[PDB]
Amino acid sequence: QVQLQESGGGLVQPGGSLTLSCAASGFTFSSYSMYWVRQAPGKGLEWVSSINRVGSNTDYADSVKGRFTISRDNAKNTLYLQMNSLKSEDTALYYCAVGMYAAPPWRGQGTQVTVSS
Ligand SMILES: [Cl-]
């Protein structure tokens, strides 16, 4: 079946880093642009980052620009998000998805990141 599995979340103090991974299976990963989106209580769903099919073009929400980096491995069918200089406001459940607004199975079940003093 179509599966997207996020991992790499954790609890970390502000200023710290994390790297999220998303293992894709059950479809041709290379045929899809990929997205990181995040949801946190009271803030709804907000887009974080996107990458085209081969990684030659990437985009970032304004709030994470210069701090986060999206990348993909089309051999391993894996999506990544390296996060630096984490803030409180980055606390959220992070999902990877084939679209900004995709729903399961085309969005994963998420990985929690909690940035707390
Ligand atoms: Cl909410």
Q: Rounded to the nearest whole angstrom, what is the distance from the C-alpha of residue 89 to the centroid of ligand 1?
A: 14
Q: How far is CA 65 from the centre of its chain?
A: 14
Instruction: Output b/e per residue, 15-47; b: 16+ Cβ within 10 A.
Output: eeebebbbbbeebebeebbbbbbbebeeeeeeb
Tokens, residue 46: 């907000």
Tokens, residue 87: 């803030």
Neighbours of ion ligand 1 (CB under 5 A): 41
Give the residue among 63, 40, 25 at the shortest CA–CA distance from 114: 40
| Domain edges within the chain | 1-117
Tell me if 106 sits within 8 A of 43, measured CB to CB.
Answer: no
SS (H, E, C) the chain: CCEEEEECCEEECCCCCEEEEEEEECCCHHHCCEEEEEEECCCEEEEEEEECCCCCCEEECCCCCCCEEEEEECCCCEEEEEECCCCHHHCEEEEEECCCCCCCCCECCCEEEEECC
Task: Report the DSSP beta bridge partners of residue 107.
Answer: 97
Enter the resolution in angstroms: 2.3
Q: Rounded to the nearest whole angstrom, what is the distance from the C-alpha of residue 39 to the centroid of ligand 1?
A: 7
Phi, psi of 69 (to 5 degrees): -135, 125
Q: What CATH fold (topology level) applies to the domain 1-117?
A: Immunoglobulin-like (2.60.40)
Q: Rounded to the nearest whole angstrom, what is the distance from the C-alpha of residue 58 to the centroid of ligand 1?
A: 27
